[PDB]
Short mmCIF file of C-alpha atoms and ligand atoms in Angstrom, two decimals:
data_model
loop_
_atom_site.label_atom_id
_atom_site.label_comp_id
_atom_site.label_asym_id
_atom_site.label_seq_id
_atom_site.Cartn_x
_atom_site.Cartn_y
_atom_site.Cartn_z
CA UNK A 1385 -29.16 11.72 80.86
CA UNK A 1386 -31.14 9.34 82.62
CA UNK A 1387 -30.83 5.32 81.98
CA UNK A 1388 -33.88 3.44 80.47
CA UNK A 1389 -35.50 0.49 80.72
CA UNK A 1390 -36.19 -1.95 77.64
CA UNK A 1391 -38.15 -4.72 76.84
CA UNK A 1392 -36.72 -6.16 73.95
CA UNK A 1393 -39.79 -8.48 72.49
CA UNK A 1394 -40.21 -10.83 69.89
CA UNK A 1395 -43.19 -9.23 68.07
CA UNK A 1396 -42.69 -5.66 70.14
CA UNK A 1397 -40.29 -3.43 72.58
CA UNK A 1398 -41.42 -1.40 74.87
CA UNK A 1399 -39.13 1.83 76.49
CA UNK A 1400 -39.47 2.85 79.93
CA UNK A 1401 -37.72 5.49 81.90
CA UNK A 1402 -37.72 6.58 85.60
CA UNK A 1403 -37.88 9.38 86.94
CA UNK A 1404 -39.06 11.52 89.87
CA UNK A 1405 -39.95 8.05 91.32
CA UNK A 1406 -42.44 7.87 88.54
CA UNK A 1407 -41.74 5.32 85.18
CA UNK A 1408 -42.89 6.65 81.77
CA UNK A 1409 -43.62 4.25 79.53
CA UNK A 1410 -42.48 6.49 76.17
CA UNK A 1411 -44.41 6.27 72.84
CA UNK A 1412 -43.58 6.23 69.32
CA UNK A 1413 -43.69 8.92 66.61
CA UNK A 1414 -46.95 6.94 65.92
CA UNK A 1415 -48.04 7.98 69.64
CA UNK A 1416 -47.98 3.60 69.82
CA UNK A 1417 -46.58 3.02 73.37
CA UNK A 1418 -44.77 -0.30 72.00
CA UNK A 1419 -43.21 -0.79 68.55
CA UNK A 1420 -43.19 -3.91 66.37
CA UNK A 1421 -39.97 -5.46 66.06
CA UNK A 1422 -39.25 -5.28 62.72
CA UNK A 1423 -36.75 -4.32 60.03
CA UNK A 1424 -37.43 -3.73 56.63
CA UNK A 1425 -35.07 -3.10 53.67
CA UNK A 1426 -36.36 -1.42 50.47
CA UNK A 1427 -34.67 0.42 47.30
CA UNK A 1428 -34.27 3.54 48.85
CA UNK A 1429 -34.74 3.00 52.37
CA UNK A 1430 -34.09 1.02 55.94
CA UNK A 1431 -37.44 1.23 57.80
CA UNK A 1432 -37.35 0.28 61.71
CA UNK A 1433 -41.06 -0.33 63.78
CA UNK A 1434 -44.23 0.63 62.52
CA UNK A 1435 -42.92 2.06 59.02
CA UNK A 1436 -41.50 -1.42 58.44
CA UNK A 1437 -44.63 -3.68 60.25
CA UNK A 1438 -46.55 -1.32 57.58
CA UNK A 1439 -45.39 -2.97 54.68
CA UNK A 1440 -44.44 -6.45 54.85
CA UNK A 1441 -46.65 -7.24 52.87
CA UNK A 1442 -45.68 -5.43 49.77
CA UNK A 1443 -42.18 -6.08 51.01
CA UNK A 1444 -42.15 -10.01 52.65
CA UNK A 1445 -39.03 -11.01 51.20
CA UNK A 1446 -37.03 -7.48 52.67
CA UNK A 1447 -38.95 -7.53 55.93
CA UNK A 1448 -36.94 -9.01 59.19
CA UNK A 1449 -38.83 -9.79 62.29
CA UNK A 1450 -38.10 -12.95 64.87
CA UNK A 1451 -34.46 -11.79 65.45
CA UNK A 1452 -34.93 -12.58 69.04
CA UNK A 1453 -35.30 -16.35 68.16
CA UNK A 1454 -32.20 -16.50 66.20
CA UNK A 1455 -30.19 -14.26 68.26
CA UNK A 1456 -26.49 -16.65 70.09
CA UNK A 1457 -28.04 -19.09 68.37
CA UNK A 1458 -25.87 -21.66 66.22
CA UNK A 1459 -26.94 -22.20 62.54
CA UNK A 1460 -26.70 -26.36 63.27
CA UNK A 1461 -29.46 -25.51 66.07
CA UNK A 1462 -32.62 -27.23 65.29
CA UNK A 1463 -34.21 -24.63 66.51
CA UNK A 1464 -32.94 -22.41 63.61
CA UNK A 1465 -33.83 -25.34 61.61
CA UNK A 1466 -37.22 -25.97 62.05
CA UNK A 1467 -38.38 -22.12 62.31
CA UNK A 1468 -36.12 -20.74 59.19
CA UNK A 1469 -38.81 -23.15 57.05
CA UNK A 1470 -41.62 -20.81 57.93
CA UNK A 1471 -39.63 -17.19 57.66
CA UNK A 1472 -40.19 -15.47 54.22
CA UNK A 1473 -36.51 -14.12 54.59
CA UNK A 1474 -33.75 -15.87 54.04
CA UNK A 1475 -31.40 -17.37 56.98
CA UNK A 1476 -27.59 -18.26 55.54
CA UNK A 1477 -24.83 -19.83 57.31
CA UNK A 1478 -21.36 -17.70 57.94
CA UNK A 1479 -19.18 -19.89 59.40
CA UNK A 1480 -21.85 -22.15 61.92
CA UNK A 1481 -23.31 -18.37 62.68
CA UNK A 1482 -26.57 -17.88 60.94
CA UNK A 1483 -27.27 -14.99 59.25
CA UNK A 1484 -30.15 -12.85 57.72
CA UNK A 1485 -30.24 -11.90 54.21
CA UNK A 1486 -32.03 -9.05 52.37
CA UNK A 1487 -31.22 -6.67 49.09
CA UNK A 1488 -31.20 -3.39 49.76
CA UNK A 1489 -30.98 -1.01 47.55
CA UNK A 1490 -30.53 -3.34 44.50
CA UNK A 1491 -27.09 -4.94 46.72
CA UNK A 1492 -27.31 -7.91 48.09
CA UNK A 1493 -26.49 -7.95 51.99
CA UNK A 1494 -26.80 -9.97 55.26
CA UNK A 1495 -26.72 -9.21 58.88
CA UNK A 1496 -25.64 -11.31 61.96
CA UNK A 1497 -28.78 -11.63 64.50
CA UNK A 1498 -27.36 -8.88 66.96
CA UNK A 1499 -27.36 -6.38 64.33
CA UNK A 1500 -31.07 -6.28 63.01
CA UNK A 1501 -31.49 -6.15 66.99
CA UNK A 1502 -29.60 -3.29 67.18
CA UNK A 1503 -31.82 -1.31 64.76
CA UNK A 1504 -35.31 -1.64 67.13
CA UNK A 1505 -32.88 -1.08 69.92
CA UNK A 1506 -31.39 1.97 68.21
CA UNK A 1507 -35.24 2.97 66.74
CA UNK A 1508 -36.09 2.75 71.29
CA UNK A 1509 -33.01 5.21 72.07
CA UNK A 1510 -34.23 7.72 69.72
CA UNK A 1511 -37.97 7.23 70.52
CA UNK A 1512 -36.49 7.64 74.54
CA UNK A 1513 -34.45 10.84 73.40
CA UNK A 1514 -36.98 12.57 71.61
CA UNK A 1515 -38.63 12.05 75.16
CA UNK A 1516 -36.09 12.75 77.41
CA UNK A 1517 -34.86 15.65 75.11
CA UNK A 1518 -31.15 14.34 75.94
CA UNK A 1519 -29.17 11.59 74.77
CA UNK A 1520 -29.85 8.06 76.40
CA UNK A 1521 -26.31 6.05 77.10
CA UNK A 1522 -26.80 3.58 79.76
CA UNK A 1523 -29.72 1.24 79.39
CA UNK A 1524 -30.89 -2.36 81.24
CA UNK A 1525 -32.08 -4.54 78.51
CA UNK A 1526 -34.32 -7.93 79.21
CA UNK A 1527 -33.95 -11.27 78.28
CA UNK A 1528 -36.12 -14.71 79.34
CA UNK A 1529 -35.03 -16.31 82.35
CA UNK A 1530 -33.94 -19.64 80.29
CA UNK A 1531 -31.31 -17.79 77.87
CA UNK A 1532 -28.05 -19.05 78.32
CA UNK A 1533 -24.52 -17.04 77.59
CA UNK A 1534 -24.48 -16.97 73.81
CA UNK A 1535 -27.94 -15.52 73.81
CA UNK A 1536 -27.07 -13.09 76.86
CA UNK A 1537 -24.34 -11.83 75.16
CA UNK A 1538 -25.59 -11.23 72.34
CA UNK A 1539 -28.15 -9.33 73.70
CA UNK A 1540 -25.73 -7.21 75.33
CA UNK A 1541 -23.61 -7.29 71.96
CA UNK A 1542 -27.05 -5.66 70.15
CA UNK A 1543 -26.92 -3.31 72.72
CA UNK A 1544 -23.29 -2.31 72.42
CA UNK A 1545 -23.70 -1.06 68.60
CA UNK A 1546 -26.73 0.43 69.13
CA UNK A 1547 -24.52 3.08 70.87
CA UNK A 1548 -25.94 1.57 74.00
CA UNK A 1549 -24.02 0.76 77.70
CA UNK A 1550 -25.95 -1.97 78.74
CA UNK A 1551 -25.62 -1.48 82.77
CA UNK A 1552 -27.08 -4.88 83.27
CA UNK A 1553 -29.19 -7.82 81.75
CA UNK A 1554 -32.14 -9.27 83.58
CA UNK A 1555 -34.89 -11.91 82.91
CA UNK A 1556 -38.09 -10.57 81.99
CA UNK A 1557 -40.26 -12.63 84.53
CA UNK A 1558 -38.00 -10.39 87.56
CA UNK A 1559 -38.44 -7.10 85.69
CA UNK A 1560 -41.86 -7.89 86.01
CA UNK A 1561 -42.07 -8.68 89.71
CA UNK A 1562 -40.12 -5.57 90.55
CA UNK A 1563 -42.44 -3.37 88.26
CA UNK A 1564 -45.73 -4.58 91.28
CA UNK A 1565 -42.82 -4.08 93.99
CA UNK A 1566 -43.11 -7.71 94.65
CA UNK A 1567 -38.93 -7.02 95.42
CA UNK A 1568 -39.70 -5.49 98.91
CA UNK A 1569 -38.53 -7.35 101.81
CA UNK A 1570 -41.06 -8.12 104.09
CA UNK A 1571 -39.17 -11.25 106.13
CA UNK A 1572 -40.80 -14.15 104.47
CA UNK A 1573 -40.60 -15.87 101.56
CA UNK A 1574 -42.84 -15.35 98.92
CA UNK A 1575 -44.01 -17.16 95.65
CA UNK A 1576 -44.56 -15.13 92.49
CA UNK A 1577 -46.23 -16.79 89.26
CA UNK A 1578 -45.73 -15.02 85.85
CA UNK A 1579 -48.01 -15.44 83.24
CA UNK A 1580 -46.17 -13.93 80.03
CA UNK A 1581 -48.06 -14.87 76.78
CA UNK A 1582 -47.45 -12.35 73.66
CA UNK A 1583 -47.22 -12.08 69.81
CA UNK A 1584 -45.45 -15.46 69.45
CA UNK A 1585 -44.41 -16.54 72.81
CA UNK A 1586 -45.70 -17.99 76.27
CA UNK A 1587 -43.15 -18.16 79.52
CA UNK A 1588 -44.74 -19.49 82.83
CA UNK A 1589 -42.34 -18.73 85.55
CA UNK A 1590 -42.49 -19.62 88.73
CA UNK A 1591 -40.57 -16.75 91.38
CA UNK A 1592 -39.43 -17.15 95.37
CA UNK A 1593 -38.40 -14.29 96.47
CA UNK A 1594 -36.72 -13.70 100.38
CA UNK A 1595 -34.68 -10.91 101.41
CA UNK A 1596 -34.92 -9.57 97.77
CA UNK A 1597 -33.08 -11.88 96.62
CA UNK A 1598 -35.16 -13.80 93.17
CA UNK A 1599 -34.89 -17.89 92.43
CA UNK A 1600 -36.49 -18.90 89.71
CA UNK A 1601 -37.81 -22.32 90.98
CA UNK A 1602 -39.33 -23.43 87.21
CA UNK A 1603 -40.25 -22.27 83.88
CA UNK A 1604 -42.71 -23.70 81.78
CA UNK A 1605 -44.18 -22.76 78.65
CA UNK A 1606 -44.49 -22.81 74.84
CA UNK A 1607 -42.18 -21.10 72.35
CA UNK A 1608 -44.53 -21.13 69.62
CA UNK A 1609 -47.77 -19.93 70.77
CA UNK A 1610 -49.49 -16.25 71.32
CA UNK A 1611 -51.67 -13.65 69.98
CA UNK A 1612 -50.65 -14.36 66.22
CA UNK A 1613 -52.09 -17.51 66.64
CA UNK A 1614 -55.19 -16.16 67.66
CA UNK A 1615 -55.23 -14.16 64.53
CA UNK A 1616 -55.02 -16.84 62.07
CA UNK A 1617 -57.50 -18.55 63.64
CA UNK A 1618 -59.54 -15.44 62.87
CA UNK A 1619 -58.08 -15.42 58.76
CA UNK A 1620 -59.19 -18.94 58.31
CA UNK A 1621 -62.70 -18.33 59.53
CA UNK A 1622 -62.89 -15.12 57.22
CA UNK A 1623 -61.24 -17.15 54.44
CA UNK A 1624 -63.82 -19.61 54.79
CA UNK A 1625 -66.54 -16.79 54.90
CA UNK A 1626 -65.39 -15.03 52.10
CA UNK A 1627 -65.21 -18.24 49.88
CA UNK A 1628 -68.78 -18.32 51.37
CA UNK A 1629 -70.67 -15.24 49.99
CA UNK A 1630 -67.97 -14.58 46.86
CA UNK A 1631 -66.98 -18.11 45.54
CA UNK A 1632 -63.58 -17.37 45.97
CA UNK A 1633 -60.84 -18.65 47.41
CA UNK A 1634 -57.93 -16.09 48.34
CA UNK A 1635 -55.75 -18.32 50.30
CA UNK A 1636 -53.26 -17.94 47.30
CA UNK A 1637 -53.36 -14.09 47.25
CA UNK A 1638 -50.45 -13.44 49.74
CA UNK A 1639 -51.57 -9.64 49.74
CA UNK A 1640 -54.79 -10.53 50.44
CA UNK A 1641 -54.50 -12.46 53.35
CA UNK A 1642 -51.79 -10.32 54.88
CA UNK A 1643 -54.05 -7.42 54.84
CA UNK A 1644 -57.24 -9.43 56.03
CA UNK A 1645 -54.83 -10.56 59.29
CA UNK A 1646 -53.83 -6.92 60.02
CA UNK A 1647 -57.67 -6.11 60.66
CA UNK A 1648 -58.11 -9.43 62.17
CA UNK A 1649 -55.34 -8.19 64.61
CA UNK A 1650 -56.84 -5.25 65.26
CA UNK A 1651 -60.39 -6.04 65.96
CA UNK A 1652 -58.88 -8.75 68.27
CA UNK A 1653 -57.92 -5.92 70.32
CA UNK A 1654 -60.88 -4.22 70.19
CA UNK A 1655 -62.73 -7.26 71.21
CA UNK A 1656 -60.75 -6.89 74.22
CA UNK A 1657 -62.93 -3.79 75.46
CA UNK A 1658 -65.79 -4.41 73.41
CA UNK A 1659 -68.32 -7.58 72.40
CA UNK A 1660 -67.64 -7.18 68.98
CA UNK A 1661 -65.89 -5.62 65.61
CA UNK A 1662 -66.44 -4.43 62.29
CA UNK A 1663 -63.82 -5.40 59.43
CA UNK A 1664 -63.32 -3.01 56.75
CA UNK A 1665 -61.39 -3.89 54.42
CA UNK A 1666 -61.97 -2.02 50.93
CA UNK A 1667 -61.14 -4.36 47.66
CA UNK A 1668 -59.80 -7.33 49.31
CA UNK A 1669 -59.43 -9.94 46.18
CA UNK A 1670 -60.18 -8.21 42.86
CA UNK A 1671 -62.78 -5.57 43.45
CA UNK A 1672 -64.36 -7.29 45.89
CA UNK A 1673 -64.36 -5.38 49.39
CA UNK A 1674 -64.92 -7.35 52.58
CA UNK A 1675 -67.29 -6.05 54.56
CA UNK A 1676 -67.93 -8.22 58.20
CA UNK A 1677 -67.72 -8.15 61.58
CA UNK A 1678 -67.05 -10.96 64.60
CA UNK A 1679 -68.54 -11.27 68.01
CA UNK A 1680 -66.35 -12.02 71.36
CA UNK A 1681 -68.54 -15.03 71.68
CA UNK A 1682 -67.63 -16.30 68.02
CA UNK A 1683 -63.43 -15.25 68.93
CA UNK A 1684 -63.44 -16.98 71.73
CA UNK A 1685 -65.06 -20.56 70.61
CA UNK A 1686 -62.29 -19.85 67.42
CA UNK A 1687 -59.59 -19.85 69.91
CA UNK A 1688 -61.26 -22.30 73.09
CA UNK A 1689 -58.57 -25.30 72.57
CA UNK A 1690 -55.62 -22.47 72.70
CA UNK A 1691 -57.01 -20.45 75.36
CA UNK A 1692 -57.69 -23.85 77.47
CA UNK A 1693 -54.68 -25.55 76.65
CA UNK A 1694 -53.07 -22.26 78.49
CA UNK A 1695 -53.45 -24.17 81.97
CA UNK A 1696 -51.24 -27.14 81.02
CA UNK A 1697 -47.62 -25.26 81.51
CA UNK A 1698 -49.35 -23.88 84.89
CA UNK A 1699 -49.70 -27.17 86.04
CA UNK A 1700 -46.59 -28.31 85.14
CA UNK A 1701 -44.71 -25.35 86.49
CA UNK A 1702 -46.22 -26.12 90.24
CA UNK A 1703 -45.52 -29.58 89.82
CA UNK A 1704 -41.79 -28.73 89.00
CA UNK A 1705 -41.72 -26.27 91.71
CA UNK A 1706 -43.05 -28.27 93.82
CA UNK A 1707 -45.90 -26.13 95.08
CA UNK A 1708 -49.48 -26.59 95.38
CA UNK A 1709 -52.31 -23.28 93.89
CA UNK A 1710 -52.89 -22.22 97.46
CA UNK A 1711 -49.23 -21.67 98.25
CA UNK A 1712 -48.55 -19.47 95.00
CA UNK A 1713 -48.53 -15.40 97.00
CA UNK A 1714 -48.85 -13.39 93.98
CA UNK A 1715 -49.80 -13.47 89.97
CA UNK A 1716 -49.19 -11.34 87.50
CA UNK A 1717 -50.16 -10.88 83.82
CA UNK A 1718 -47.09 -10.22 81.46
CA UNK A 1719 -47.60 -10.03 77.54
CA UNK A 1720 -50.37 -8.35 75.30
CA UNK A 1721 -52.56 -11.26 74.78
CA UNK A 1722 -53.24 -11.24 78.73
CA UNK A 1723 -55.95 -8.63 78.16
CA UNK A 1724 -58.37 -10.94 76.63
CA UNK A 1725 -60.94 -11.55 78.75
CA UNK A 1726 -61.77 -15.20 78.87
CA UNK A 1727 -58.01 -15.46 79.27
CA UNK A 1728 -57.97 -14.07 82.32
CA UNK A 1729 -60.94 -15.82 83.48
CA UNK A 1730 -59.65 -19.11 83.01
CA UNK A 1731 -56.48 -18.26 85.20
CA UNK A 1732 -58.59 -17.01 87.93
CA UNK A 1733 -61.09 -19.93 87.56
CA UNK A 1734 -58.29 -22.05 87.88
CA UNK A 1735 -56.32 -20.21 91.14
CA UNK A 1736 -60.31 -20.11 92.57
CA UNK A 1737 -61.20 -16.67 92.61
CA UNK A 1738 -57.77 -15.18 93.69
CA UNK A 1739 -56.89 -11.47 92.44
CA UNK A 1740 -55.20 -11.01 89.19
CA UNK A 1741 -52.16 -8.10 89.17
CA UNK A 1742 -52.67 -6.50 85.85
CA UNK A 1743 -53.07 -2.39 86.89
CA UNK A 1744 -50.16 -2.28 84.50
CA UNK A 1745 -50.47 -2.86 80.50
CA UNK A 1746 -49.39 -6.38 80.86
CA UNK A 1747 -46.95 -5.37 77.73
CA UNK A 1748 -45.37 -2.62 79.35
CA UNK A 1749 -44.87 -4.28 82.98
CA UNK A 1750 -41.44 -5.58 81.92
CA UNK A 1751 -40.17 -2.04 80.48
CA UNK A 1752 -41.47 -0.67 83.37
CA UNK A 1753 -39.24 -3.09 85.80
CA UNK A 1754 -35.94 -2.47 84.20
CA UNK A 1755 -36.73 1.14 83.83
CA UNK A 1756 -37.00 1.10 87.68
CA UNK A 1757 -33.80 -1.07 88.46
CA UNK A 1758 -32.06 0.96 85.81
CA UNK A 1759 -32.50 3.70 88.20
CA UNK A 1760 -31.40 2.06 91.06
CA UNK A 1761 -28.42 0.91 89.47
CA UNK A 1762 -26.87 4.68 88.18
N1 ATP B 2931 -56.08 -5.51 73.63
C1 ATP B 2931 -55.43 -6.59 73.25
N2 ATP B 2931 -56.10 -7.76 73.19
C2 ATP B 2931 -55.47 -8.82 72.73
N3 ATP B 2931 -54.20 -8.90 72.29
C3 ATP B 2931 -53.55 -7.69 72.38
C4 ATP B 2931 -54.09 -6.53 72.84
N4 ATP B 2931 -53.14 -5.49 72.80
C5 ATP B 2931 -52.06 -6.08 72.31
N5 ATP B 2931 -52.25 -7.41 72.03
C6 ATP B 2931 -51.38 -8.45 71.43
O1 ATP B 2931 -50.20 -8.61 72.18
C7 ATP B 2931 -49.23 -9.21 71.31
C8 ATP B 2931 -47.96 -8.42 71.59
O2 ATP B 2931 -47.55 -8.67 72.91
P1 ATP B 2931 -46.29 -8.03 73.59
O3 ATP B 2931 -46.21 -6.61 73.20
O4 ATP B 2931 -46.34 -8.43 75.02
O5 ATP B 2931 -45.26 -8.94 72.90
P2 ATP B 2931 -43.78 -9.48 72.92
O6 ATP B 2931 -42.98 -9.40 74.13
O7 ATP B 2931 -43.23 -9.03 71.65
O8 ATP B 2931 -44.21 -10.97 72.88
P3 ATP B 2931 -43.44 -12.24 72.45
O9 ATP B 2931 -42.12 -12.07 73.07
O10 ATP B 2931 -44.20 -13.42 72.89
O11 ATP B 2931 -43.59 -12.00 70.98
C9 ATP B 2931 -49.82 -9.17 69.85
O12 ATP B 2931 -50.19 -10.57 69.61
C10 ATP B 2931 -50.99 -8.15 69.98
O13 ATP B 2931 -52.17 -8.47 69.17
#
C-alpha cells in the first residue's frame, strides 16, 4: 500500500496520500476533509474526531484534546504548568512524565501523551484505508520546526503504536514549502515566509532554500493564539447580547456557552465566503432560543487588536533573519484561520501588494507536503 502524509494538528489532522503524481487530501466518514483532534471516553465507548468534538460538552471532564502541547514534555515544565490550569481534564504526574486522566467505563484510567496521539493517528490510518482500500504501514508524520528530541520522539513513538512506520519526521513549515514546489532547484537561493496560524497556534517561519536543501533562518510566533480565540471573542459579544434582550446571564451555564461557541465557530467560517451569518440555536438557556446573526464588518472590529497584532512576529522574524520585505521570494498561508479575509489583507498590505500562495486549503498544505515526500521517500 501506498505511504501517507499527516498533519498531526493541535485542534485538527489532516491525511494526504500521493499518487499518480496527484495528492488526495482524504475525508472523514463525516465527508470533513480534516478531523478534530480529540479523544473522548464515555461509559460504553472511546470516541476519536468528530464523534468525540460532538460531545464535549455533555462530556468535558472525559474529553482529551491539546495532546500535542503536552506531548515529550516533562510534568515540572512550566509549560505543562501554566496550560493544565485551563484544561477541564485532568493532567497527573507518573514519575516527572505527565499524564492524562479520564474514567472510562466507570474505571478510572490515564494515558501517557503519545498514546491519546495515537488514537487520531490510528482514527487517520483507517480514514486513509477506507480510501486507499488497502492497509496504510509507512507514513511521514509532521512536527513544528522548534520541537526538540523528546517531542520528536514522541511523535514518532505515537506513531509506532498506532501500527504506524513512521519513514520520517519533518517540520510543518517545509512540508508546506514542498506542497507549492518551492523545493525545486533553480540555482539561487530563495527566501520562503510561512504564515501558519490555526485553532490554537501561530508559527512564523522564515525558509532559505538552495540546492533543495531547507534552513530555517527564524521562527517567530505565538503559542497561544488562533481561530478559537476568534470565537470567544464572538461568545462574549453574544453573551452580552443575550443578557441584552433576555435579562440573563448564561456565562455560568457551561452547556450553554459550549453550544453558543460551536455556532459561533461555524458562522466564522461562513463569514469567510460570505458578509454575514445567521445563529440558530434552539433553547439556549431555559426555553429561551437564540435567534441572531453577525456581519463580517461587526467580526472583524471583534477581532481588529488580534488580527493586527498578527504583524508583530513578522517583523520580528525578518529582523532575526536578517532580511528586509523586499528580499522575502515567496509566502504562503498555512493554518485554517488564514482564510479570513481581512487576514489576508493585512499580510499583503504589509508585503505591499505582493501575491499571496494559498491555491491550497491553507489546512491541508502541510498533509499535502508530507504526502508528497512520503512518496519520494518509498
Ligand atoms: N473558513 C474558515 N474561516 C476561518 N477559520 C476557519 C475556516 N475553516 C477552518 N477554520 C479554522 O481553522 C482552525 C483549524 O485550523 P487547522 O486545521 O489549520 O489547525 P491545526 O493545525 O490544528 O492548528 P493548530 O496547530 O494551531 O491548532 C479552527 O480555528 C477553524 O475554525
Amino acid at each position: 500500500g501506498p505511504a501517507v502524509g499527516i498533519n498531526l494538528g493541535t485542534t485538527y489532522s489532516c491525511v494526504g496520500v500521493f499518487q499518480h503524481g496527484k495528492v488526495e487530501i482524504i475525508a472523514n466518514d463525516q465527508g470533513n476533509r480534516t478531523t478534530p483532534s480529540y479523544v473522548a471516553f464515555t461509559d460504553t465507548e472511546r470516541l476519536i474526531g468528530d464523534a468525540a468534538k460532538n460531545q464535549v460538552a455533555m462530556n468535558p471532564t472525559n474529553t482529551v484534546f491539546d495532546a500535542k502541547r503536552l506531548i515529550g514534555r516533562r510534568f515540572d515544565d512550566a509549560v505543562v504548568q501554566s496550560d493544565m490550569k485551563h484544561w477541564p481534564f485532568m493532567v497527573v504526574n507518573d514519575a516527572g512524565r505527565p499524564k492524562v486522566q479520564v474514567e472510562y467505563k466507570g474505571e478510572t484510567k490515564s494515558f501517557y501523551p503519545e498514546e491519546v496521539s495515537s488514537m487520531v493517528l490510528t482514527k487517520m490510518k483507517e480514514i486513509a484505508e477506507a480510501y486507499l482500500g488497502k492497509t496504510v504501514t509507512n507514513a511521514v508524520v509532521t512536527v513544528p520546526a522548534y520541537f526538540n528530541d523528546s517531542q520528536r520522539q514522541a511523535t514518532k513513538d505515537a506513531g509506532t503504536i498506532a501500527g504506524l512506520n513512521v519513514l520520517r519526521i519533518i517540520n510543518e513549515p517545509t512540508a508546506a514549502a514542498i506542497a507549492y514546489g518551492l523545493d525545486k532547484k533553480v540555482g539561487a537561493e530563495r527566501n520562503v515566509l510561512i504564515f501558519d496560524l490555526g485553532g490554537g497556534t501561530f508559527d512564523v517561519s522564515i525558509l532559505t532554500i538552495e540546492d533543495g536543501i531547507f534552513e530555517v533562518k527564524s521562527t517567530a510566533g505565538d503559542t497561544h493564539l488562533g481561530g478559537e480565540d476568534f470565537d470567544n471573542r464572538m461568545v462574549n459579544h453574544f453573551i452580552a447580547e443575550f443578557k441584552r434582550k433576555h435579562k440573563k446571564d448564561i456565562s455560568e451555564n457551561k452547556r450553554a456557552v459550549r453550544r453558543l461557541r460551536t455556532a459561533c465557530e461555524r458562522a466564522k467560517r461562513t463569514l469567510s465566503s460570505s458578509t454575514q451569518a445567521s445563529i440558530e440555536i434552539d433553547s439556549l438557556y431555559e426555553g429561551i432560543d437564540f435567534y441572531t446573526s453577525i456581519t463580517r464588518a461587526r467580526f472583524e472590529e471583534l477581532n481588529a487588536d488580534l488580527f493586527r497584532g498578527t504583524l508583530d512576529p513578522v517583523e520580528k522574524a525578518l529582523r532575526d533573519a536578517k532580511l528586509d520585505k523586499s528580499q522575502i521570494h515567496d509566502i504562503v498561508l498555512v493554518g485554517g484561520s488564514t482564510r479570513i479575509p481581512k487576514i489576508q489583507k493585512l499580510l499583503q498590505d504589509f508585503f505591499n501588494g505582493k501575491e499571496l500562495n494559498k491555491s491550497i486549503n491553507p489546512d491541508e498544505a502541510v498533509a499535502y507536503g508530507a504526502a508528497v515526500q512520503a512518496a519520494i521517500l518509498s
